[PDB]
Design a protein around this nucleic acid. Sequence first.
DNA 1: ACTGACTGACTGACTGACTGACTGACTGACTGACTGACTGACTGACTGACTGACTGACTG
DNA 2: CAGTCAGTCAGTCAGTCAGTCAGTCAGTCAGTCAGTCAGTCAGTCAGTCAGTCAGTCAGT
Lengths: 604, 689
Amino acid sequence: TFFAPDAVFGDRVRRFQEFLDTFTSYRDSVRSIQVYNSNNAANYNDDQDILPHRIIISLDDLREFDRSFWSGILVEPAYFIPPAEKALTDLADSMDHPWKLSFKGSFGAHALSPRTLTAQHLNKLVSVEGIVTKTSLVRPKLIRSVHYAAKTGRFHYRDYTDATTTLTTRIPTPAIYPTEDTEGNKLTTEYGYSTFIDHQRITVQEMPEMAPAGQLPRSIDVILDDDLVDKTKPGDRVNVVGVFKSLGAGGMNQSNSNTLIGFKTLILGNTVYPLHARSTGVAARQMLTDFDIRNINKLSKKKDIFDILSQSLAPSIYGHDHIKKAILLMLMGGVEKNLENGSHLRGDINILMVGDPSTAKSQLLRFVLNTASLAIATTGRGSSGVGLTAAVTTDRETGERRLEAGAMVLADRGVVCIDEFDKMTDVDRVAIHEVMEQQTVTIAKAGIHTTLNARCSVIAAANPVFGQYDVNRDPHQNIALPDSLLSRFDLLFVVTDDINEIRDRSISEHVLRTHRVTIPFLRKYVQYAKERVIPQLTQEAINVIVKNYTDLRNDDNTKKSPITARTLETLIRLATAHAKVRLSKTVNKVDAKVAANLLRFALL
Amino acid sequence: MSAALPSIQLPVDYNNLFNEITDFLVTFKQDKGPKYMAMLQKVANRELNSVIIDLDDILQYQNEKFLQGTQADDLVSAIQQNANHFTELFCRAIDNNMPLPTKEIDYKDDVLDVILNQRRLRNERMLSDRTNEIRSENLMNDALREVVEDETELFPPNLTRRYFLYFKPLSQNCARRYRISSKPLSVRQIKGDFLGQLITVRGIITRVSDVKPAVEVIAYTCDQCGYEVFQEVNSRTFTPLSECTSEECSQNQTKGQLFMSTRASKFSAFQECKIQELSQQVPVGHIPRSLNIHVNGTLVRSLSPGDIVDVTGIFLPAPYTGFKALKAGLLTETYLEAQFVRQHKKKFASFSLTSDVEERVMELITSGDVYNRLAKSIAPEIYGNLDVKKALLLLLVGGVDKRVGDGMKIRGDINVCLMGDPGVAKSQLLKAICKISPRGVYTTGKGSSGVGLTAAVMKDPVTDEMILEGGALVLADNGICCIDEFDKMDESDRTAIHEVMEQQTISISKAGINTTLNARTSILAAANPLYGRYNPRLSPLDNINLPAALLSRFDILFLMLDIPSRDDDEKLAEHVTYVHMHNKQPDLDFTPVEPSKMREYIAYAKTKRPVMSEAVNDYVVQAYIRLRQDSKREMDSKFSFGQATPRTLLGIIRLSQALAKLRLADMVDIDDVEEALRLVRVSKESLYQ
DNA sequence: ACTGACTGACTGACTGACTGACTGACTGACTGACTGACTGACTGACTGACTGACTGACTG
DNA sequence: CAGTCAGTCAGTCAGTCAGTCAGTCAGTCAGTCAGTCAGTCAGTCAGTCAGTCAGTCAGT
Ligand SMILES: Nc1ncnc2c1ncn2[C@@H]1O[C@H](COP(=O)(O)OP(=O)(O)O)[C@@H](O)[C@H]1O
Ligand SMILES: Nc1ncnc2c1ncn2[C@@H]1O[C@H](COP(=O)(O)OP(=O)(O)O)[C@@H](O)[C@H]1O
């Protein structure tokens, strides 16, 4: 007997036992965790000769099970969480350790931002969201010691506790780190058998998209635990569900007190979820039921789907099919081939638009900013620290210099949507030269010489030099950002403003009826097209791009400028991407025809 | 005692493991006689300081004993689980048996030897005096030994040691042959549940500090009683002590007073550094972390900054927490002890052996036509430009410096520019040759500041104080410093580079520095022409944004044209598409040399120092009369480049001396200097088409 | 030879001075605590130097 | 009439030093606390006397 607990604790354990045996999915989840760790242990104990312990409980069911247990948890959680955890360890031990819970909700009008937190909400269960800054370092915490004795040869043992334990209180008893037992003998300690459990604390500010007009922000701080270390990098957007504990003696202990108001507050646990934002953080968690992949397989084998998905990104924009084809070929992105003992070769596609004003060149990039995943938009400026980190760190614990990522490091595997590309000064264009082929960013400022990684994809939309004169004088510097910047870009779409009468009609009823295939299927098509499967190139497609490339040199070197081997490499990239679209494995002549036609319309 | 600080039993025994470790220490025959009597006799003969106890001989001993009968107690996993107790247990297993007298002491040997000799001899005479006293007071002889051995205070055997002891982890090869202790981990992977084991990391060393002595035991004298009161120090800070703690100045009225001395303590070198994450093993959106390393003993001075290393050591705690208001008890803040250091990219010229090496080198020598094969081998995955690869092999060889007794020094080194734009694949060569050569640093245009690639001054944590933290150029000396986009550099950086063009020198007169640091580097540059590209209407140096003085400091200058031509395009297309189709280019009939064996060849080649002769004097002189003669009859700003400075003469003797080393001959001949004049006249003057 | 008269010895009740426990003020002592600031690194605003972009004005 | 060169402001970067905040400390002084003691009070035990009974002697 610990303290031979009361029949109240028996009442809570029996009732929650009845609920957990009422709905029977959770038993199957426990069975899945237990079998998976079992067979992993069989692989690690049989050939050569991980998953945590928590069950996600939703608060849907308890509202239709018991009002008492429902409104019991959301008011006083230090009386209702340790019984339910005790019964769940009873079930998991009986079917074949902590076994914590989650409480995914649906929360009870406790959806509050940390502006309105304190203080009559104290010691309840509260859900908080916001930005994460300024995440500290990971340190291990000690729980159990083990000592070897000399010379009698008996191990020993000791426990340790704290105030950030299970959620009740306890009359504290400190305990010296032992040495020289009775009778007097040296106790040489040991490691490897003495346990350790990790520990980390992060602080949370309220959202800037939700904040007031201009005021100072106000923030709280969260302690994490064993299986929650290192989920959220600083800069994310994070939902936290926990218990708003208030520990410490607030200066009422000793008289003539300083630290005028004590009772410092924090949040324990419990279930940090990262969530999707508009501009930072992955959204690849989107579900794929078997109905959905069965429908993808149903539409997967047609012969017009490139012309269906061409006209899918334009629900309300007239014309410009070939731009849409280029944007889908960007979102598929090609394949990445890293060599053995050399340098890798680049996979994606880079697109520049240029043309007259009022041509929906800025309306398009917001649409690519919505449908894709990890889009980051930079307009104008810029300096300092888009392509770099600027290294401004003043770490308080010790003299050390960290890095704070800009816009180029953070958008990895993503899309960067730059507007007004001519307004950039050349000093940042040095950094764009460093990104767009070298695929690395070397920073050796004060400092620490590093070489991190960033392999983004770039879309820009620049204005002409003077007027709308896109065809009048010559193509030779209507753009005027020479010359390597013209060569790094794959495609150069040149958009004009022709005047007609039929074009005025077709624009007219489109714009008029707009004031009065579907995309959340289309991105589920996209990610399944991306992870499976990479194609290989075959013999049927070499000679088309070889003959086509010698054609483009021997004649387009008589028409226009410039042509490098980078054109050949982008031919291979668009061939691979159009092979990815049809969910195939090999490469056909059809792909070389389509990419050939796109490069014809792009250049000529 | 029960009921407070209780007990636990575990399967681990420390009884038969000591006996088995004795049996392993004596009887191991595999590598004249046994293995450890030879090395341990070599230790007691005072010509050696460390002992490498691997983890392969133990495992082979367990399979041997497992097949002989009887069953052998599992010991390798017992080392891998705990790995801290076994240095002391193993080392007091060594000390029972040692082949002592094998050589008399030299007079001029050392001071640590003679101190440990007097401690040993005094210990013997003290132990014999008491049995010369009690034995004459009577009243098999094991009992009298047990009497004398417990009424006499002695120097404990923790202090008369003279050596150190280092483990060594097991390969994948030995674990593959018979079927973990060394899986190469990353710094993100080290969970807080490995504290005590024996692990292996990899990363780039940054900020390695100085070597300064740290104390282990401190030796006082008592001046009245005559004792020597020791004291061990485990912590960071210690405190001195007072009157006495002997058995004679205690239990008396008049205690003495003690004060320390430094020729009787025991010191140990000490040096700490940091491992940063390798930046290839990172997730998609993260930043490299770090993790400290202490280094004790013989292993010091083997951690050069800016490398790629495989440190294997054990992983302990060391008590601290940060601000006082953030502590929850009993947060611990880990580090990594070092045991054995293995580098990738092994550094010349830290090698001596030749016998086994010729089994690989003489295959390349007996392969026939070594030179054009190696010229093919550097970055094979591009097409064309055999002459550029041809010159850059001569960059990697280099040599040979010369002191003329004044002493003014000459170089000794080659400096190469690259010109032309954009699709001649010049960045691939810079990443390539700044990956073959050890100690090679690749910095872009902007990029580093002026203070980034010169040194700066910053305060140093724990070891003190005020060390000059190096920049890019001080990091990569006796190496190759690749540079991208040379035109966009700030003008202060230009004068820094011009100061590197004169040898050894960067001079600083900023706010806290008056120094003249050293740099023996080699510079490869890559400048772009004026926009857009290559107008033969435009003159040379019109399309170049650099003065001809800087053109004169480069002894070898190139230019890579870009002219559309019908015949090469099919070979280029079949080349590139042949690798996107596969992952290896060459065929019919050639294999690429692996880069490790190539670095063994070039690392072998730099120990020759060839010597010129008298016929090459005539030929070099007359060729210089040719170049000097026709170079100054034009005098124009045309496609000609005036005026063929004598830096070309020193550079062409230096290229001859570089080509002579790859024959490995000290046989400077006419094919040498003829080859050099070929690379000079073909080097430039490619802008005719 | 027995019985009453007297007598010492024992035995029970009375008398009081000792004996053992109990618990309120007085003061040294002894330890918190805070006042005595002191120290020391670190952080945050001030200020000049420099290098880049803009524009007049000069020249082909 | 258009390119260019040089002058010129502007933004940004590195050096500068005065506040600032956290950690330690010794002396003293005061606040309480415990050991001192003294007076109270009931219990208890040894001295002392009176009564009563058995022994013994003398009278009839
Ligand atoms: N082809 C088109 N179809 C429909 N709307 C168009 C079309 N072209 C331009 N627009 C209109 O032009 C506006 C966007 O202007 P835009 O060209 O994107 O800005 P900017 O040229 O300044 O970048 C949108 O409001 C859109 O209604
Ligand atoms: N002969 C060649 N063989 C293979 N690839 C080539 C060749 N010539 C050009 N290329 C391609 O041209 C590109 C040149 O770009 P890079 O060398 O990175 O910088 P820069 O454009 O400054 O030379 C390379 O990516 C390479 O793929």
